[PDB]
Design a protein around this ligand. Structure first.
Ligand SMILES: CCCCCCCC/C=C\CCCCCCCC(=O)O[C@@H](COC(=O)CCCCCCCCCCCCCCC)COP(=O)([O-])OCC[N+](C)(C)C
Ligand SMILES: CCCCCCCC/C=C\CCCCCCCC(=O)O[C@@H](COC(=O)CCCCCCCCCCCCCCC)COP(=O)([O-])OCC[N+](C)(C)C
Ligand SMILES: O=c1ccn([C@@H]2O[C@H](COP(=O)(O)OP(=O)(O)O)[C@@H](O)[C@H]2O)c(=O)[nH]1
Ligand SMILES: O=c1ccn([C@@H]2O[C@H](COP(=O)(O)OP(=O)(O)O)[C@@H](O)[C@H]2O)c(=O)[nH]1
Ligand SMILES: [Mg+2]
Ligand SMILES: [Mg+2]
Ligand SMILES: [Mg+2]
Ligand SMILES: [Mg+2]
Lengths: 627, 627
């Protein structure tokens, strides 16, 4: 029809939560009978190329075609596309890649020219393009995208929003939620990220979850894309992230969704029951000097999670639906990789502290007593993992040093200068990582970071060689304990991956992750903390921000060293001991005890998350069997 | 006359070294017979209050009145003021304090209104006000300045330049030298700083030096002002800088001016024979990626020094005239104090490296062989002091630790937990100083720096207490050596100060300096190095700058630790030793040997500079006796 034959345009000019009273309308509401939309898809693209958006949008229409092809369903059928809308928010006309605009206009999504920057002495906060397309893309080559319109293609109700300035994504989502979502009032709103291709039936699988009324938030698995013929896995930096994604989705998502709280809905792919997130959630998500109030913006997405679980007089829960997945890409060079993880570490850490500091809010929600108890246990366990990850640094170095010294002492042959050399390499690498993080930037000095990761890698190889060497000699003759613990944790990893029915990561892309683990402990952490926050009031916030940043780093480093001093007897406590007896030995029983403790704890964590995986999978199997 | 009755104004609009061909003139050249100026005084003021400029300007006219009152002189007499000009360059109309403009216009130096920002579509690089005043100020109260015009006041040929923008002072001096000084061609140009009051006869004393033709550069003493009734000395931060100024001027100026090269002409008060500095000196001073070429701007003033000594086929020398002094003020709070010394440490360090790297240029100058040899020895000695100051940090901590441990070991009573506590305080203070320097700013966290200086102070008190305690017990029963060395260095300091005939600093303001010395080693250094330097080409320089900054800090810290490890046997070398014998002791003979070495060297340095002071004073006395 005409709306499918022409693309309407409009100029928004008001604060996002004002659209309703501002008398701004949309086509969905202007039909003779209003179209009751069931679902909204939000795509955020910043400067993405046409190919990336093409991947994501192909996933979109493939899903919608599948839903329209469904026969036995009350919600869907031949006209199912009517209840669907895809909102594409882009940030800033200047930064958006016209290379992508070519594809958009190729769809009839966009036409240029009718965009006066301001009207009636009033600038247009953002531009909006309204259309429902009938053409669909069928193939995406490495540089070419195939657009075809046949009797098999299906309609899509697009809605292209374009802001005109740099707004940190916290703004984009505002327009999505407090703006359009207030007008259309969809039941379900799903967030993607440009360049993330949903699975061909991922969307429907995820949607099926919201049959259960209590469900308020859900997500799916996230898979690193491997391109043509897995050609990317040969790189050790893409492969390592693949493995990490896969273990995270297998273990932590299932274990947490057992209880009901899922820590971070992947912003790559997530979905929210609109009614549940209305009111308090968006308010604390958008509007927040005191610590929590002025810092929570670094835990942007994960806050919503918390509050939706803890909503007063309300019993919303969160679920991880294993049957839906989205395939995305990961950085290839170390610099931008570090500039990525510097965001997740802080986000998770601040959400962790904030949640645990406000756990008592859970009991004042509407959940049942048993569910409330389970949530409390989950929060305590989660806080426990934050505590362990905070003592990552000292734990790693201490394990390293104790193992190295013990082997050289035990055999005296040549592991000796190896002990000293490796200690010095550790010191230089850690110190240099500090100063480069604090003063410099990652992208300026790529070559050194590449060297840093390599040095830590060979350190891990050496550690492993010593570990196996002592194990072998001892068995030929705590180390029986270490071989037990490591064999156990590896076996548990394997059996869990098999149960989940994706074991092809346990052997393909495992060694890369093991060799990168030191870089995940001593580089990502250091750079993460060193860039916490990245006269007039502005400088006053800046002074406060610097205060917090340079206070957290001090506490972190000092406390880790406290542990190192207590165990290794560094910091002159050992001297104080010897001279107290006067009124120093090499290593004490403390080293053996602590060394056992760290591996004991690691095996404990693996076992618990394994149980979580088993329970979640079993429950899904039983409900499927009954269904 | 009319020029004394009216103030002429003009709008400069050309690069500073273009004034001559640009057909821009000055009154001094427009008289029926050109006035052969003998001397130019340059005053730079940035945002100084009227009082500070009043102090400096009072010093100025008092000196000129004294010269005009001279009777037996070929150069001066009743009309001596004719050969004098005072150029007052201020930077930026926006930043200059109108509170000072009130005084300036009170003198008829400035009138507002005739200052079109641009003319003929050409902006005025800077504005210039020409006048010769007859009134003089007679008194400067704490808030009021007394301007009187009587038969005793004397004419002053002022010349008020005003730029319109932030230009780092390297620009101001350009206009002084390559601009006006090229027109007037004075014999002698003297640089002050606003707020620095020359001594009532300091200028004439300094001028008398340029009787000797070879002299190219000279300066005088710099005295911290003490205000009314020395009321400032009670503060321990003004007092400490007073003492440091006084020792520096007594020892280093005299010793260096013995040879001929004076490292840094105090920009507060200095004087240059114009002819000598023409050509190469200004060129390398103004116009300079490779290290030296792109970094020398941090040694701005001291470069000229070097080149003027090393000018090819020319035998210019530098002299320190003790008979001339200038009294200035010093910062009172720790923040701006640190932001001051962060400039001198880098300036001296870069000039030191640059000079010593180019010492071979001296022999290709015009000096005699004996003078060339003396200059070479002076350069080597100076480079030696840079080397010692670079190992300041490890030397201080190592002395501290060795002394503390030895005393607690020797007596076991309670110095024990004192050893551990103080070690921990040192670690925390140093680490925190690093991170606050690198990430934060001084002014943001004043309170912590005040705490830092205090903690280091009590550490020094403790060190001293242990030192005297061991000395006392040993004498009742290397430490005989330490008491010898410290008694020697203190005695040499005293005798030198007496010889110079200003001993009233040795007892008034000594304890403050001693207690602040740790802050001079572990805080000023750290912050100095951590702020070395403070797509498009601009970001490319920035990347290079960050590279150099974060490389120098690494080398400094690593090398200092190399020394600490070798001496104290830290870094596991001690472990390697014990386990080598296997195939650790507390302290070795290394500690005693090095401990003796540091004090031995300190006594050596004091003795040498003492000899320098004695020779300079003796030579001045003998020449005065003959004169
Ligand atoms: C204490 C807690 C401090 C916490 C603060 C900071 C946390 C980090 C602590 C690192 C490890 C310190 C280990 C330690 O006990 O100190 C060592 C020495 O003393 C030092 O080396 C002190 C180093 C302080 C560093 C402060 C930050 C600036 C680093 C850059 C500074 C510039 C570079 C130069 C730095 C010297 C221990 O030496 P030792 O083993 O006793 O030696 C004798 C051994 N023997 C008896 C077997 C013969
Ligand atoms: C080596 C050269 C490295 C040069 C690099 C850096 C220069 C600065 C060196 C400081 C002094 C180190 C002293 C040293 O030898 O290491 C100590 C331990 O190991 C450490 O403590 C290593 C500390 C490395 C710091 C790197 C920068 C990051 C600091 C923040 C990092 C996060 C905070 C936590 C840090 C752990 C020596 O311990 P020990 O005395 O052998 O203990 C047994 C004593 N016993 C036998 C008597 C029982
Ligand atoms: O100004 C911004 C910042 C972020 N993003 C979104 O966040 C991504 C950049 O972050 P990245 O993909 O590396 O990981 P994320 O930070 O989302 O975890 C972009 O591709 C967008 O999906 C955006 O669109 N605009
Ligand atoms: O933009 C500037 C920078 C510096 N100065 C001069 O340098 C002083 C500031 O430095 P300070 O006096 O603290 O010591 P200096 O840096 O000269 O050693 C000012 O008072 C001026 O004399 C100036 O006039 N303008
Ligand atoms: Mg991405
Ligand atoms: Mg990315
Ligand atoms: Mg000053
Ligand atoms: Mg100053």
């Amino acid at each position: 029809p005409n709306e499918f034959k022409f693309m309407r345009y409009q100029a928004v000019t008001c604060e996002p939560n004002q659209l309703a009273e501002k008398n701004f309308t949309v086509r969905q509401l202007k039909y003779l009978t209003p179209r009751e939309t069931e679902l909204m898809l939000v795509v955020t693209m910043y400067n993405e190329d046409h190919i990336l958006l093409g991947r994501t949008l192909k996933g979109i229409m493939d899903n919608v075609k599948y839903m329209v092809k469904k026969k036995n369903s009350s919600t869907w059928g031949p006209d199912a596309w009517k209840k669907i809308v895809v909102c594409i928010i882009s940030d800033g006309r200047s930064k958006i890649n016209e290379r992508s605009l070519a594809l958009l206009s190729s769809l009839g999504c966009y036409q240029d020219g009718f965009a006066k920057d301001e009207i009636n002495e009033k600038k247009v906060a953002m531009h909006v393009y309204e259309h429902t397309t009938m053409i669909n893309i069928t193939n995406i080559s490495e540089s070419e995208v195939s657009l075809e319109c046949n009797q098999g293609t299906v309609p899509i109700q697009l809605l292209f929003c374009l802001k005109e300035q740099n707004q940190k994504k916290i703004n984009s989502h505002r327009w999505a939620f407090e703006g359009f979502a207030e007008l259309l009032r969809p039941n379900i709103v799903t967030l993607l990220d440009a360049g993330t291709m949903p699975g061909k039936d991922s969307i429907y699988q995820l949607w099926r979850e919201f049959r259960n009324p209590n469900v308020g938030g859900a997500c799916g698995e996230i898979r690193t894309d491997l391109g043509k013929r897995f050609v990317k896995l040969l790189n050790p930096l893409v492969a390592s992230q693949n493995f990490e994604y896969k273990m995270s989705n297998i273990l932590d998502k299932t274990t947490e969704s057992n209880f009901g709280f899922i820590t971070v809905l992947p912003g790559a792919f997530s979905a929210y029951r609109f009614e549940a997130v209305r009111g308090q959630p968006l308010q604390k998500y958008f509007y927040g000097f005191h610590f929590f109030s002025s810092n929570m913006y670094l835990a942007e997405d994960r806050i919503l999670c918390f509050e939706v679980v803890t909503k007063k007089n309300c019993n919303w829960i969160l679920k991880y639906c294993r049957s839906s997945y989205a395939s995305t890409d990961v950085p290839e060079r170390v610099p931008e990789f570090i500039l990525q993880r510097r965001r997740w570490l802080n986000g998770s850490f601040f959400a962790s502290v904030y949640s645990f500091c406000h756990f008592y809010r859970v009991w004042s929600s509407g959940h049942n007593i048993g569910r409330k108890l389970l949530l409390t246990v989950e929060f305590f366990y989660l806080f426990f993992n934050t505590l362990i990850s905070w003592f990552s640094l000292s734990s790693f170095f201490l394990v390293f040093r104790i193992l190295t010294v013990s082997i050289a002492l035990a055999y005296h042959s040549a592991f000796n200068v190896l002990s000293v050399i490796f200690l010095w390499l550790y010191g230089i690498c850690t110190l240099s990582t500090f100063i480069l993080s604090l003063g410099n930037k990652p992208k300026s000095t790529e070559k050194f970071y590449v060297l840093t990761c390599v040095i830590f890698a060979v350190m891990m190889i050496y550690m492993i060689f010593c570990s196996i060497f002592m194990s072998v000699k001892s068995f030929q003759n705590a180390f029986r304990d270490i071989v037990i613990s490591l064999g156990s944790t590896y076996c548990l990893y394997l059996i869990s991956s098999i149960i989940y029915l994706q074991p092809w990561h346990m052997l393909t892309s495992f060694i890369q992750y093991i060799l990168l683990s030191p870089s995940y402990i001593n580089v990502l952490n250091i750079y993460a903390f060193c860039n916490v926050h990245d006269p007039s009031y502005d400088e006053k916030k800046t002074g406060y921000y610097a205060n917090v940043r340079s206070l957290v780093i001090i506490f972190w480093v000092i406390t880790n060293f406290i542990i190192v001093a207590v165990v290794l007897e560094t910091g002159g406590i050992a001297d104080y001991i010897a001279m107290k007896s006067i009124s120093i030995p090499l290593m004490t029983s403390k080293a053996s005890i602590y060394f056992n403790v760290i591996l004991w704890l690691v095996a404990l964590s693996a076992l618990i998350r394994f149980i979580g995986c088993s329970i979640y999978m079993i429950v899904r199997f039983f409900k499927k069997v009954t269904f």
